[PDB]
Amino acid sequence: FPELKNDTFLRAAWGEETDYTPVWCMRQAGRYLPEFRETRAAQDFFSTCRSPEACCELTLQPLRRFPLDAAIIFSDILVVPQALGMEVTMVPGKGPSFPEPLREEQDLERLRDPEVVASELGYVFQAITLTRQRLAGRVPLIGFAGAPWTLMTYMVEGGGSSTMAQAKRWLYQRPQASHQLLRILTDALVPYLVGQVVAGAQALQLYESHAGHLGPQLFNKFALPYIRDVAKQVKARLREAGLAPVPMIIFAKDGHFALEELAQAGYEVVGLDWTVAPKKARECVGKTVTLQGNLDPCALYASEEEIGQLVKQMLDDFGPHRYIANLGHGLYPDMDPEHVGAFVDAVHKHSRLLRQ
Amino acid sequence: FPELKNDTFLRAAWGEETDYTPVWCMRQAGRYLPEFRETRAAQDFFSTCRSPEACCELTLQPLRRFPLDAAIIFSDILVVPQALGMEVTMVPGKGPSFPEPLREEQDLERLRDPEVVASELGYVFQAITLTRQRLAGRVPLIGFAGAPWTLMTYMVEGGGSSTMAQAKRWLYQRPQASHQLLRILTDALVPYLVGQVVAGAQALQLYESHAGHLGPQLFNKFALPYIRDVAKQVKARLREAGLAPVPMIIFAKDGHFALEELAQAGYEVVGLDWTVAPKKARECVGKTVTLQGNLDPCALYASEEEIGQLVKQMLDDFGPHRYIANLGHGLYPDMDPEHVGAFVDAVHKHSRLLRQ
Numbered sequence: 001f002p003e004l005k006n007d008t009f010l011r012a013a014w015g016e017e018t019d020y021t022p023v024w025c026m027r028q029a030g031r032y033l034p035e036f037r038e039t040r041a042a043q044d045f046f047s048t049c050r051s052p053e054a055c056c057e058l059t060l061q062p063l064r065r066f067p068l069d070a071a072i073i074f075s076d077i078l079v080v081p082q083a084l085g086m087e088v089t090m091v092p093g094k095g096p097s098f099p100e101p102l103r104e105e106q107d108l109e110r111l112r113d114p115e116v117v118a119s120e121l122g123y124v125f126q127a128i129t130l131t132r133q134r135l136a137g138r139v140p141l142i143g144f145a146g147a148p149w150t151l152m153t154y155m156v157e158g159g160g161s162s163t164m165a166q167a168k169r170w171l172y173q174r175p176q177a178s179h180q181l182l183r184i185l186t187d188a189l190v191p192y193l194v195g196q197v198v199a200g201a202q203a204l205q206l207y208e209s210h211a212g213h214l215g216p217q218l219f220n221k222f223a224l225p226y227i228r229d230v231a232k233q234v235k236a237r238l239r240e241a242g243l244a245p246v247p248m249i250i251f252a253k254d255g256h257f258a259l260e261e262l263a264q265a266g267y268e269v270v271g272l273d274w275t276v277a278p279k280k281a282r283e284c285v286g287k288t289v290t291l292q293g294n295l296d297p298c299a300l301y302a303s304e305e306e307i308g309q310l311v312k313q314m315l316d317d318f319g320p321h322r323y324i325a326n327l328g329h330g331l332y333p334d335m336d337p338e339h340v341g342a343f344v345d346a347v348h349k350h351s352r353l354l355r356q
Numbered sequence: 357f358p359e360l361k362n363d364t365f366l367r368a369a370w371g372e373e374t375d376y377t378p379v380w381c382m383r384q385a386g387r388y389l390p391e392f393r394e395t396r397a398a399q400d401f402f403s404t405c406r407s408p409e410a411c412c413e414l415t416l417q418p419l420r421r422f423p424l425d426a427a428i429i430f431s432d433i434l435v436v437p438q439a440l441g442m443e444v445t446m447v448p449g450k451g452p453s454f455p456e457p458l459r460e461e462q463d464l465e466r467l468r469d470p471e472v473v474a475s476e477l478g479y480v481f482q483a484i485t486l487t488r489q490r491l492a493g494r495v496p497l498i499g500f501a502g503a504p505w506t507l508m509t510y511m512v513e514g515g516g517s518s519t520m521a522q523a524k525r526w527l528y529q530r531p532q533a534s535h536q537l538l539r540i541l542t543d544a545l546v547p548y549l550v551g552q553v554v555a556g557a558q559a560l561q562l563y564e565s566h567a568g569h570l571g572p573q574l575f576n577k578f579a580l581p582y583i584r585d586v587a588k589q590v591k592a593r594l595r596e597a598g599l600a601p602v603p604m605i606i607f608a609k610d611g612h613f614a615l616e617e618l619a620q621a622g623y624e625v626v627g628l629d630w631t632v633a634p635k636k637a638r639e640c641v642g643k644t645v646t647l648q649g650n651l652d653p654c655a656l657y658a659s660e661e662e663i664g665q666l667v668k669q670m671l672d673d674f675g676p677h678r679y680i681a682n683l684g685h686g687l688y689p690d691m692d693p694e695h696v697g698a699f700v701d702a703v704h705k706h707s708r709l710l711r712q
Contacts (some may be wrong), residue, residue, distance in 0.1 A: 162518050163685075164654065172658040212610070215630040215652055254568070256612045257631055274571040275613055296571055298520065301530040329519075 001200055002137040009070040012324050013203060013247035013268050013334050015290055021315065021323060021351035022069035023344050024142075026251075027330030028062040029074045033337065036059050045096055046076070046088055055127035056134060063138065065337060066344045070203070073128055073196070077207065079147040080188060081155045083120035085112045093172030097159025103166070105177040114187035118195050125199035127141045132200035140203055147208040147250075148185040148226035152178070155185075164213040171214075171222055178222065186226045190233040197238060203247040205271070206230065212254025219258050228265045235266070249292060253329065259284040273328035278317035291318060294328040300339040307339060311346035315354055325351075357556055358493040365426040365496050368680050369603035369624050371646055377671065377679060377707035378425035379700050380498075382607075383686030384418040385430045389693065391417050400445055401452055402432070411483035412490060419494065421693060422700045426496045426559070429552070430486055433502040433563065436544060437511045439476035440623075443466045453515025459522070461533040470543035474551050481555035488556035496559055499552030503564040503606075504541040504582035508534070520569040527570075527578055534578065536662060542582045546589040553594060559603040561627070562586065568610025575614050584621045591622070605648060609685065615640040629684035634673035647674060650684040656695040663695060667702035671710055681707075 004010075009022040011278070031037060039057060040048070048054040059072035078096055082088055102108065107241050132141050153167040170178050193204050206224060226295070231248055238245045250262055251271030262270050263285040270289055272281055274296035281291060299310050314325070325347040331340070360366075365378040387393060395413060402508065404410040412602050414430035434452055438444055468476070486498050500505070502510070509523040526534050549560050564579060587604055594601045606618055607627030619641040620625050626645055628637055630652035637647060655666050670681070683702040687696070 014378070165688075168654045169657050172655055172662070212631065216633050218652075254610065257633060257636075273682075275568065275610070277572050277613060280613075296524075296574075298524045299528055301525050306528070332521075 001132050004137040004140060004202075006069065006139045008246060009324065010203065012322070013249075013269070013290055015288070015322055016337050017046070017321065017350065021168065021320065021347055021354075023325040023347040024063070024068045024070045024072065025327050025331055025340065025343075026072070028066075028068060028072065028340075029058045030331050031333035032331050032335045032340070033061060033065075045090055046078075046082070048073070049079075050123050050126060052123055052127035052130050055124070056130045057143075059127070059131045060134065061133070061136045062340075066341050067348070068344065070142055071131070071135060071138075072142040072144060072205065073124070073131060073201065075124055075127075077150070078154060078159075079121060079124065080117065080145060080192060081151055082182070083112070083117045083192075084188060084263060084335050085110055091195075098155065099158070101166075102156050102181070105174055108177070108184070109183060111184060114184055115191060117188040118191040121195065124192075125195055128196050128199035128201055132202070140223065141201060142205055143193065143199075143201030143247075144205040144207065145192055147206045147223065148182045148189065148230070149214070149223035150208050150210045151185045151189075152181055153210045153213070155181070161210070164210075166219070167210075168213055171218060175222075182222065182226050186229050187231075187336040189230050190237065193230070193234050194237045194241065197243060197246055198241065199232075201246065203249065204234070205249045205251060206267075208252040208255065210345070211252040211258065216257045219255075220261065224258070224261055224265065227262075231266045238269065251292070263289050269324065269334055271326065275328070278314065282318070290322040290324060292324040293326045295326070295343065297327045297329055297331055297335070300327075300331075300335050300343060302339075304339065304342040307342045308346045308350070310344065312350050315347070315350055320351070320354055357488050360493040360496060360558075362425065365577070365680065366559065366603060368678070369605075369646055371624070371644070371678055373677065375708065375711070377681050377703055377710075379681040379703040380426045380428065381418070381683050381687055381696065381699075382428070384422075384424060384428065384696075385414045386687050387689035388687050388691045388696070389417060389421075401446055402434075402438070405431070405435075406479050407650070408479055408483035408486050411480070412486045415483070415487045415497075415528045416490065419491070420556065422697050422705070424495065424700065426492060426498055427487070427494075428498040428500060428561065429487060429557065431479070431480055431483075431500075433492040433523060434510060434515075435477060436473065436501060436541070436548060437481065439473045439505055439548075440540070440544060441466055442511060451516055454511065455514070458512050458520075458537070459513040460704040461530055464533070464537060464540070466474040467540060470540055471547060474547040477551065480548075481551055482613055484552050484555035486644070488558070495626070497557060498559045498561055498605075499549065499555075499557030500561040500563065501545050501548055501581065503562045504538045504545065504586070505568045505570070505579035506564050507541045507545075509566045509705045511537070517566070520566075522653065523566075524569055524574070527574060531578075532660075533575060538582050542585050542589075545586050546593065549586070549590050550593045551599065553602055554597065557602065559605065560590070560603045561607060562623075562678065564606065564608040564611065567608040575611075576617065580614070580617055580621065582676055583618075587622045607648070619645050619709045625680065627682065630683070634670065638674070643678065646678040646680060649682045651682070651699065653683045653685055653687055653691070656683075656687075656691050656699060660695065660697075663698045665700045667699065668706050670677075671703070671706055676707070676710055 065160035247268040250267040272293040605625035606623040628649040
């Protein structure tokens with residue numbers, strides 16, 4: 001693979017010091033791009049996807065418009081439960097999901113065996129390898145997956161939610177079955193993520209979008225352990241492989257209550273939403289870890305000029321060392337490409353400015 | 357009105373000390389009762405409601421099954437925007453909402469004038485007066501309303517949501533219009549709540565369910581001020597009236613980031629969800645204020661025995677002084693009446709036990 005010209009992102013990730021603050025956006029490859037829809041629904045929501053070339057192309061598009069400091073592989077969170085044998089549909093033109101969710105401990109039999117999962121998701125590796133290849137070391141490439149708990153919530157609650165129903169209920173109701181499933185999700189995610197790095201992924205992001213549902217206690221009996229094993233095991237397997245381990249990021253939506261432990265689940269990076277205060281976040285986490293976030297995506301609805309100081313304040317709130325700018329959640333589909341770039345420009349503009 | 361025999365609830369509210377810990381549940385009058393559906397959809401979702409007798413009866417039902425330490429008036433959050441002139445519908449058998457939400461600054465013209473609102477909501481007062489009358493001083497009666505911001509989000513985003521869209525967008529997009537609307541909601545809520553207390557409401561709860569959407573900054577420019585004015589003005593008007601002011605409770609779902617200020621918006625009580633840790637909550641708030649909550653309603657899916665220690669831990673986590681037990685959110689419609697009572701029994705059981 002070609003050598004990395006710009007690595008501000010990996011260095012900020014690693015805690016190293018940098019000349020400016022690296023920036024990128026979650027779902028930066030998303031429906032907010034006209035070029036994106038021209039490609040996405042120019043086949044299928046879950047079998048392109050299947051074509052590396054198309055996945056590559058989606059992964060590249062935003063980088064064509066904005067000097068983002070990193071790229072993140074395009075794919076869908078559900079590809080794992082899908083690889084595990086769950087069938088997805090394409091219902092009335094908003095989003096994907098499972099018509100036949102797990103509902104009783106019995107249903108777990110329908111799942112494939114964790115190690116087979118890697119071989120099912122080979123198009124993803126290829127799209128990764130491809131994309132590392134075509135970025136040609138422009139900026140780094142981030143692989144990803146959803147975290148065990150989050151995955152469980154999609155698999156159990158059918159898909160698209162609010163603040164919880166059946167999943168949280170299994171936890172109280174049948175936790176033996178919950179233990180089990182969560183292990184299966186974990187045992188699948190380790191080889192998938194090793195996978196992405198072998199295929200040439202230079203950093204990995206774990207998404208725990210449905211942290212917020214859980215209490216602190218629930219979170220520690222049920223999400224935390226597994227967030228921990230995945231990191232532990234992915235690092236182990238990578239040594240075994242003779243590979244350099246890679247920065248790992250854990251992003252927990254509504255995870256204010258869990259920053260303390262998350263700082264010590266052995267991730268180099270902790271991703272935050274806009275609901276946490278940056279100073280109170282840094283307090284909570286210390287100085288070993290680098291923070292990521294956390295601008296409210298809705299702020300991009302303001303003017304170019306309004307954005308400037310929101311970034312400025314954020315940048316001042318977070319302060320130069322150990323930090324990667326980002327939105328506190330992925331982008332929305334109706335957002336103005338201009339303002340996505342305004343955000344980027346202001347990150348770059350005022351960070352180098354912050355450094356007199 | 358008859359004299360109050362049991363007032364544990366008002367005393368815990370006031371910071372006074374009590375022999376046991378008072379307990380009650382949000383949406384304790386809800387679809388989780390067979391007696392409830394036998395009455396609710398034995399007319400209309402928004403015009404019974406219109407019949408005090410029926411509202412009384414809904415308010416009384418849970419008190420018939422459980423020795424709750426207080427009662428809360430049955431009504432719907434939307435009655436205010438409705439009184440303000442917004443039209444509600446009755447769509448495919450889950451929940452209420454607005455088919456014609458406000459979408460442009462222009463639409464505000466369609467709203468009634470704040471002071472008229474009180475006269476529109478006279479059935480509510482009557483149902484209150486009635487219910488104070490029939491409880492015959494058994495336990496206190498809580499009136500309620502939704503907070504300005506929350507109300508704005510229903511009025512703007514049509515109704516039932518996830519973690520935000522159009523409302524948060526107005527805030528960035530057209531905040532002058534946001535200022536205005538929020539004032540109108542405030543100017544309506546003050547006479548409505550004075551109203552409930554004149555009608556015989558003994559405590560008032562303000563609901564800010566859609567706090568979580570907002571950043572700390574958004575929350576302080578846009579929800580906090582108004583949560584503050586409502587409390588200020590409701591207390592003022594009640595003096596003017598020659599009435600004893602009454603404990604006020606502010607409940608902010610996902611408001612971890614705002615406990616500090618909420619402790620000083622001049623509410624006697626701060627209601628919390630399960631997502632905040634009780635000890636970290638008490639830290640955050642100090643000793644002037646009484647806390648409320650915060651058991652996860654999904655915990656009621658566990659066994660009678662499991663519940664016992666969850667309560668026990670909660671009770672130990674919160675500790676005897678300045679505290680009202682509650683669920684961190686309202687109940688769900690499929691929950692076992694037995695376990696609602698298990699929760700109550702364990703609160704009463706182990707609080708008096710905690711006090712050797």
